[PDB]
Design an enzyme around this catalytic site. Sequence first.
Site, PDB file in Angstrom:
ATOM      1  N   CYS A  12      19.524 -97.727   0.738  1.00 26.81           N
ATOM      2  CA  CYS A  12      19.654 -97.033   2.019  1.00 26.81           C
ATOM      3  C   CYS A  12      18.896 -95.711   2.020  1.00 26.81           C
ATOM      4  O   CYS A  12      19.023 -94.915   2.966  1.00 26.81           O
ATOM      5  CB  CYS A  12      21.124 -96.766   2.346  1.00 26.81           C
ATOM      6  SG  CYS A  12      21.855 -95.420   1.380  1.00 26.81           S
ATOM      7  N   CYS A  15      20.080 -92.597  -2.305  1.00 27.13           N
ATOM      8  CA  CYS A  15      19.882 -92.169  -3.691  1.00 27.13           C
ATOM      9  C   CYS A  15      18.639 -91.263  -3.836  1.00 27.13           C
ATOM     10  O   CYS A  15      18.618 -90.343  -4.656  1.00 27.13           O
ATOM     11  CB  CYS A  15      19.834 -93.375  -4.639  1.00 27.13           C
ATOM     12  SG  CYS A  15      21.440 -94.208  -4.845  1.00 27.13           S
ATOM     13  N   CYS A 115      24.558 -99.577  -5.943  1.00 29.63           N
ATOM     14  CA  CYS A 115      23.873-100.826  -5.591  1.00 29.63           C
ATOM     15  C   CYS A 115      23.059-101.340  -6.779  1.00 29.63           C
ATOM     16  O   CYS A 115      23.213-102.489  -7.201  1.00 29.63           O
ATOM     17  CB  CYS A 115      22.945-100.661  -4.375  1.00 29.63           C
ATOM     18  SG  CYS A 115      23.726-100.183  -2.811  1.00 29.63           S
ATOM     19  N   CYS A 153      27.668 -93.509  -4.994  1.00 33.44           N
ATOM     20  CA  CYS A 153      27.142 -93.970  -3.717  1.00 33.44           C
ATOM     21  C   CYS A 153      27.184 -92.847  -2.686  1.00 33.44           C
ATOM     22  O   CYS A 153      28.039 -92.863  -1.799  1.00 33.44           O
ATOM     23  CB  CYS A 153      27.941 -95.188  -3.228  1.00 33.44           C
ATOM     24  SG  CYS A 153      27.181 -96.079  -1.820  1.00 33.44           S
ATOM     25  N   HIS A 202      41.223 -88.031 -11.632  1.00 32.60           N
ATOM     26  CA  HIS A 202      42.656 -87.762 -11.498  1.00 32.60           C
ATOM     27  C   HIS A 202      43.246 -86.894 -12.623  1.00 32.60           C
ATOM     28  O   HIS A 202      44.060 -85.990 -12.362  1.00 32.60           O
ATOM     29  CB  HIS A 202      43.384 -89.104 -11.374  1.00 32.60           C
ATOM     30  CG  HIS A 202      44.881 -89.021 -11.341  1.00 32.60           C
ATOM     31  ND1 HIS A 202      45.587 -88.634 -10.222  1.00 32.60           N
ATOM     32  CD2 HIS A 202      45.809 -89.343 -12.276  1.00 32.60           C
ATOM     33  CE1 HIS A 202      46.881 -88.692 -10.477  1.00 32.60           C
ATOM     34  NE2 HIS A 202      47.042 -89.123 -11.717  1.00 32.60           N
ATOM     35  N   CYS A 205      42.335 -83.393 -11.841  1.00 31.55           N
ATOM     36  CA  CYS A 205      42.402 -83.008 -10.439  1.00 31.55           C
ATOM     37  C   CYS A 205      43.282 -81.775 -10.246  1.00 31.55           C
ATOM     38  O   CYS A 205      44.312 -81.635 -10.893  1.00 31.55           O
ATOM     39  CB  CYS A 205      42.903 -84.174  -9.584  1.00 31.55           C
ATOM     40  SG  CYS A 205      43.014 -83.845  -7.804  1.00 31.55           S
ATOM     41  N   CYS A 226      49.123 -83.980  -2.772  1.00 37.36           N
ATOM     42  CA  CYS A 226      48.257 -84.996  -3.359  1.00 37.36           C
ATOM     43  C   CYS A 226      47.792 -85.967  -2.266  1.00 37.36           C
ATOM     44  O   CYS A 226      48.520 -86.210  -1.298  1.00 37.36           O
ATOM     45  CB  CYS A 226      49.037 -85.730  -4.451  1.00 37.36           C
ATOM     46  SG  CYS A 226      48.303 -87.250  -5.089  1.00 37.36           S
ATOM     47  N   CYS A 232      43.622 -92.118  -1.988  1.00 31.82           N
ATOM     48  CA  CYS A 232      42.780 -91.568  -3.051  1.00 31.82           C
ATOM     49  C   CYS A 232      42.670 -92.474  -4.290  1.00 31.82           C
ATOM     50  O   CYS A 232      43.678 -92.901  -4.860  1.00 31.82           O
ATOM     51  CB  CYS A 232      43.247 -90.168  -3.433  1.00 31.82           C
ATOM     52  SG  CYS A 232      42.187 -89.338  -4.649  1.00 31.82           S
ATOM     53  N   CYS A 241      33.079 -84.894 -10.432  1.00 26.62           N
ATOM     54  CA  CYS A 241      33.012 -84.225  -9.135  1.00 26.62           C
ATOM     55  C   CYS A 241      34.014 -83.084  -9.009  1.00 26.62           C
ATOM     56  O   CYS A 241      33.784 -82.130  -8.267  1.00 26.62           O
ATOM     57  CB  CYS A 241      33.293 -85.229  -8.017  1.00 26.62           C
ATOM     58  SG  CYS A 241      32.294 -86.709  -8.094  1.00 26.62           S
ATOM     59  N   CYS A 253      34.963 -84.650  -2.386  1.00 26.37           N
ATOM     60  CA  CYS A 253      35.624 -85.659  -1.580  1.00 26.37           C
ATOM     61  C   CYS A 253      37.123 -85.486  -1.555  1.00 26.37           C
ATOM     62  O   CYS A 253      37.750 -85.689  -0.516  1.00 26.37           O
ATOM     63  CB  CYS A 253      35.276 -87.059  -2.104  1.00 26.37           C
ATOM     64  SG  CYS A 253      33.500 -87.268  -2.350  1.00 26.37           S
ATOM     65  N   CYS A 259      38.963 -89.441  -2.616  1.00 24.24           N
ATOM     66  CA  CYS A 259      37.977 -90.122  -3.459  1.00 24.24           C
ATOM     67  C   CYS A 259      38.007 -91.628  -3.135  1.00 24.24           C
ATOM     68  O   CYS A 259      39.083 -92.204  -2.976  1.00 24.24           O
ATOM     69  CB  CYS A 259      38.271 -89.878  -4.948  1.00 24.24           C
ATOM     70  SG  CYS A 259      37.199 -90.806  -6.129  1.00 24.24           S
ATOM     71  N   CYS A 262      33.416 -94.249  -5.791  1.00 26.32           N
ATOM     72  CA  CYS A 262      32.062 -94.727  -5.485  1.00 26.32           C
ATOM     73  C   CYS A 262      31.189 -95.020  -6.705  1.00 26.32           C
ATOM     74  O   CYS A 262      30.165 -95.710  -6.595  1.00 26.32           O
ATOM     75  CB  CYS A 262      31.339 -93.767  -4.531  1.00 26.32           C
ATOM     76  SG  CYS A 262      30.701 -92.272  -5.306  1.00 26.32           S
TER      77      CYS A 262
HETATM   78  S1  SF4 Z   1      44.452 -86.128  -4.966  1.00 20.39           S
HETATM   79 FE1  SF4 Z   1      43.727 -88.097  -5.937  1.00 20.39          FE
HETATM   80  S2  SF4 Z   1      42.830 -87.509  -7.969  1.00 20.39           S
HETATM   81 FE2  SF4 Z   1      44.096 -85.735  -7.197  1.00 20.39          FE
HETATM   82  S3  SF4 Z   1      46.184 -85.977  -8.131  1.00 20.39           S
HETATM   83 FE3  SF4 Z   1      46.269 -86.999  -6.093  1.00 20.39          FE
HETATM   84  S4  SF4 Z   1      45.679 -89.210  -6.476  1.00 20.39           S
HETATM   85 FE4  SF4 Z   1      45.048 -87.992  -8.315  1.00 20.39          FE
HETATM   86  S1  SF4 Z   2      24.110 -96.606  -4.113  1.00 24.90           S
HETATM   87 FE1  SF4 Z   2      24.901 -96.030  -2.020  1.00 24.90          FE
HETATM   88  S2  SF4 Z   2      23.560 -94.212  -1.509  1.00 24.90           S
HETATM   89 FE2  SF4 Z   2      22.438 -95.354  -3.162  1.00 24.90          FE
HETATM   90  S3  SF4 Z   2      21.128 -96.990  -2.215  1.00 24.90           S
HETATM   91 FE3  SF4 Z   2      23.176 -97.985  -2.521  1.00 24.90          FE
HETATM   92  S4  SF4 Z   2      24.280 -97.662  -0.524  1.00 24.90           S
HETATM   93 FE4  SF4 Z   2      22.587 -96.119  -0.637  1.00 24.90          FE
HETATM   94  S1  SF4 Z   3      34.038 -90.831  -3.885  1.00 20.15           S
HETATM   95 FE1  SF4 Z   3      35.037 -90.028  -5.801  1.00 20.15          FE
HETATM   96  S2  SF4 Z   3      33.568 -90.515  -7.507  1.00 20.15           S
HETATM   97 FE2  SF4 Z   3      32.427 -90.707  -5.514  1.00 20.15          FE
HETATM   98  S3  SF4 Z   3      31.470 -88.628  -5.262  1.00 20.15           S
HETATM   99 FE3  SF4 Z   3      33.499 -88.610  -4.157  1.00 20.15          FE
HETATM  100  S4  SF4 Z   3      34.993 -87.721  -5.674  1.00 20.15           S
HETATM  101 FE4  SF4 Z   3      33.104 -88.362  -6.838  1.00 20.15          FE
END
Ligand code: SF4
Ligand code: SF4
Ligand code: SF4
Lengths: 277, 481
Positions: A12, A15, A115, A153, A202, A205, A226, A232, A241, A253, A259, A262
């Site tokens: 897409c 990346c 991907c 992603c 987690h 976190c 949470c 999540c 992250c 995220c 989260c 991804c």
């Molecule tokens: S927000 Fe998500 S990563 Fe953070 S403590 Fe809660 S479930 Fe775990």
């Molecule tokens: S991994 Fe996600 S951001 Fe990267 S090419 Fe695939 S769909 Fe796009």
């Molecule tokens: S979806 Fe989760 S693993 Fe992906 S960039 Fe966001 S916090 Fe990081």
Amino acid sequence: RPPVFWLQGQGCTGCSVTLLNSVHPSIADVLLKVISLEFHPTVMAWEGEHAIEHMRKVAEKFKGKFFLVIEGSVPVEADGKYCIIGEANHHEISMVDALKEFGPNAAAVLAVGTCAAYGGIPAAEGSETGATAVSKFLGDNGIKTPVVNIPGCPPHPDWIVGTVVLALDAIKKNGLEGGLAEVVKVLDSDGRPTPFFGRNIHENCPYLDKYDEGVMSATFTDKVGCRYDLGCKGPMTMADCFERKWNGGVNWCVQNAVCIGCVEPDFPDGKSPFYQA
Amino acid sequence: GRTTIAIDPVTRIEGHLKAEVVVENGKVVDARLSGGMYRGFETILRGRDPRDASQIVQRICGVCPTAHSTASVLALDEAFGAKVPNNGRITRNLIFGANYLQSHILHFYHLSAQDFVQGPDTAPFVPRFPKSDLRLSKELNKAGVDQYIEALEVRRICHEMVALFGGRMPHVQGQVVGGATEIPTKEKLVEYAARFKKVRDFVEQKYVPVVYTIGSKYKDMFKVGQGFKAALCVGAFPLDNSGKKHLFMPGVYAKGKDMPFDPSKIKEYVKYSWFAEETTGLNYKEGKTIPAPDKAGAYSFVKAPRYDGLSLEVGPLARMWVNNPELSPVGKKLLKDLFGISAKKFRDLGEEAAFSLMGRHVARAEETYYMLGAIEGWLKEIKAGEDTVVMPAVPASAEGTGFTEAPRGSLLHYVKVKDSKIDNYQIVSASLWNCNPRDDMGQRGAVEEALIGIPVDDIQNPVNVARLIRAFDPXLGCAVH
Ligand code: SF4
Ligand code: SF4
Ligand code: SF4
Ligand code: FCO
Ligand SMILES: [Fe+2]
Ligand code: NI
Ligand SMILES: [S]
């Protein structure tokens, strides 16, 4: 500045865009001081068979030594016709055929994004193109070139640049063969470099105390609790992250929403539904 | 006599595109555009929790994901009966609006500028055509290169703006059915405004002036690329809570006439597209996506959308023409100083010049300036601390349509829900309107038609073919999905 070819299959362009967002070093320093991006469809000067032929001439000159980045998955159905990446003098070149051509001769293949690393969204339930991950495709076709997965992603620019720099440094201090052996050593069982993917979201976190007390936000905009009940996937996700954060540290995220896992091999189907536990 | 030129890949666009043209007596006399990559998002989405769509659809395109995010949550809002709180509407605008800035700046400098500017003697700026028709003086060329470099930092800053309330970019987490997931705080709004000022300064002082300035060295590029001279806008950026006022208002322009947009007049043909023959001529509400990659005669994974039988174009030119706003102060000045043209509003450019290769680059720069004004306003309208989301239940059966404008043009998503899951999901995207093949009746797509008459005085260096294409800012990931 080692040559790099950047092939897009079922991608897409996210990346590529996430790479553009690299803070330190800037993408300018990456392009001018770190790598030589000889082929990239989104940004290169030339076009068409001329661009394809340029990539071929450099690949021949640097056989065994260029790096091959793959963005997107590789569709095998319908004789590869779900992804045509170029044409040379009337001969169509599918992603399947390009990978069979360049893959054997790369020093390493960097599968960038979920991907390319694992199949991702193009491989998900309801698809029908035979979207295939890079390592599986190469293995199915007897191609033994090392593959490094940098999923997400999209991935964070730091995961991409960081892995490239890691590999380039390892090669400068041990030579090509020793360098790659050094890279392979720091990959987890899903081919991801542990410097970026070795810790669980987690476990680190800032909301873990709330999780342990059983205090869950019931609406997204409640930032105290949470985010587990809101869907999540931190508990199942291996990335940094929580520390690095995103886009120059302005957000991430879990703070913003949830989260969605991804960077994981089962993304997206295994992380869905995104908005409930 | 005739020479056929095939260009695959067309570079410095998003996605996989092959262009085939026939050249005779130094002019393009026929054209075909092929979208050569297919993923099938419309089938992939079936069976999912509909709330998942607003994440899944963004992966159609990582250059314009906020556009699909927006179209998707708007569709979901209707299907779920959710009323987005005032402050959530504004927050969505700030998230999405910031990416318009990123996307137009990326397009002009990082995709388009090499059409007119010689880069440094290193990859990926070389090699290129020996005769690239690069006309700028040493000074102006250097300004282009310096600005290309600076624009790399500026577009990155735009994504920091998106991420402030959007979570991250590409692929925001912050837009969901029912609004926006994060209430803007005073502190983060200061952070967004600080970055915005830097972006505004670059757009006003560098971006808009360089486009008119380069344009004045290529005045011949206002004389070609007219095509059908027909345009679509479906509206975008709600300015209130009743779905009336939008930043861009809907409208169709064809054969010198303005008329209202009626979505029921949209049909997608597939004769020349790699999809099952029985699925031709469907409105999106009854859309079907059955790939047929071996079907004889077809040459693209892009369907052919037609509006009441018309082949139309979309994007900044379409929006700015349809809405006819006042030109930027810099644009007015440079039109006078460099072009000898007195102009107050966008249409004062005139139909022929506006619907042209260079006209489309000018429209995009003018729109970027126009968006600065809108974002300035939203920054004054937003209220720190006011809630931005509601949490609606998933309906068992519902449908919804989301209409918006992606940076590249009109976008809609249609969703049908049955048994609390996605039963059908149909996407009609911006570059679908631009980069599509012939319809069943043999009428060319917008870019196909705009290619006719394009000068190719040197078949060994046929640079204007992809120059024309790039003016539309094609995105084939979006066109095919
Ligand atoms: S927000 Fe998500 S990563 Fe953070 S403590 Fe809660 S479930 Fe775990
Ligand atoms: S991994 Fe996600 S951001 Fe990267 S090419 Fe695939 S769909 Fe796009
Ligand atoms: S979806 Fe989760 S693993 Fe992906 S960039 Fe966001 S916090 Fe990081
Ligand atoms: N902008 C953008 Fe993407 C395209 N074309 C969408 O919609
Ligand atoms: Fe579609
Ligand atoms: Ni797009
Ligand atoms: S977007």
